[PDB]
Amino acid sequence: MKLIFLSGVKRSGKDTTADFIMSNYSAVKYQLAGPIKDALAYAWGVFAANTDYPCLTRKEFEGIDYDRETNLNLTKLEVITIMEQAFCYLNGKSPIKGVFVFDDEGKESVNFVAFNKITDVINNIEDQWSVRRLMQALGTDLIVNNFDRMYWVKLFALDYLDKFNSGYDYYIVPDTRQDHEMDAARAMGATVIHVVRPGQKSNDTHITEAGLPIRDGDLVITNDGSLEELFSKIKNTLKVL
Amino acid sequence: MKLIFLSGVKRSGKDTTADFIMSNYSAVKYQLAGPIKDALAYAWGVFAANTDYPCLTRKEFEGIDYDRETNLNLTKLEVITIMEQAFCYLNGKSPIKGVFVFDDEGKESVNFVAFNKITDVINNIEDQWSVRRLMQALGTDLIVNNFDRMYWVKLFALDYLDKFNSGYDYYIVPDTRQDHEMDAARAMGATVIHVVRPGAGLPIRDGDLVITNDGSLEELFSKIKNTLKVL
């Protein structure tokens, strides 16, 4: 099995490459933001449970026929509540440093110190709450930035360890968005492929929308033409590995 | 940080190599069997409290002035309860596939099937219970063979990633005993270094480094310095 980490801003051709690889090769995929979306879909169902709030499922957090930039018109209190349920969920997958979950009859809550950092972080976010902003907030604003910078790489490692030994040719991580994820990837001997559209940018200022640095050893596919030109570049890049 | 997995049989000089590295470089060490001794020391403290059993601390589970071969005279029954408490401790570190821990008012226990597999497995162990047989039963008879072949390597992965930006030059795992664990180390980008003596062992695969301990300590030491040099 060959481990590949893909890197590319929105609409750079990176998502196209990911799909080209998944449909033309024996590949298994793992999304770093996978568990972010599972935790939010779970928290949401706990939050919108017996409310008149719309039912958002994993598919919607996946963006399947749902615009994740849609304003959900939520209050900072609602958002804090959701983040606390998302944390209780994640803590059952892998312990978040400094977080404890307590039960009061099917009512899960985090410890005060953790609940207090959630509150402070959320209270200072003035953006409107979309599925997209909730992903950015859970992933980065809270966890990476305040509890465990390597949590999402840790969950990828547990998955990889379950699968490195199977019959797939490739193991792809298509959504690398933080430099430290790239650092872990290079350390583990992953091939890092950047898909770049000559002089283009991310229309989101969140750190997870920023273009990742190209370091020595990284491969770069310049998407400066047609689609088959891209498909050819992909084929010849992989043929080499 | 360079990830190094050391391999070698008893008296090959593998242990001397881990020591020299730890003593001469910015290095941090992780034992795959660490959590095994921690869980047993935990499960032990909890069960020998109720009884008139010897008090074994994490210090004797480490074999620190204790013979881990020492028979403890346990009922397959107590061994089974010790084992379930240890699963409870480990499950809080990283979930063991197919195990759920529940609180019974000042008493967590594992779901029934996990409980049932534990009993079945501990019931065919016809041996005598030393601390050392307990480590094996927990580590291999149970977890690796019946729950998750990769569980000890998953716990190393959590710790390695945790130390990822810590400033150490090397991360050394010295006690790998299974080949599947060495496969996982290679899959995670480790350099495998075998310490062998001229005339059981894990296989030496293509890419692994081999240090032949055929001379003196200072010669062993010199071979280690030059091997670390080209990593």
Ligand SMILES: Nc1nc2c(ncn2[C@H]2C[C@H](O)[C@@H](COP(=O)(O)O)O2)c(=O)[nH]1
């Ligand atoms: N890769 C990654 N994504 C993160 C992190 N924290 C938050 N996210 C966000 C970035 C994306 O907006 C999102 C997943 O969205 P998408 O890949 O489009 O389903 O999760 C992090 O640490 N790593």
Ligand SMILES: Nc1nc2c(ncn2[C@H]2C[C@H](O)[C@@H](COP(=O)(O)O)O2)c(=O)[nH]1
């Ligand atoms: N590395 C490793 N050690 C294991 C595993 N299962 C059980 N062990 C235990 C059995 C040995 O007696 C013990 C070594 O403990 P020590 O003497 O403190 O280094 O490791 C396993 O899967 N991997």
Ligand SMILES: [Mg+2]
């Ligand atoms: Mg909950």
Ligand SMILES: [Mg+2]
């Ligand atoms: Mg316990």
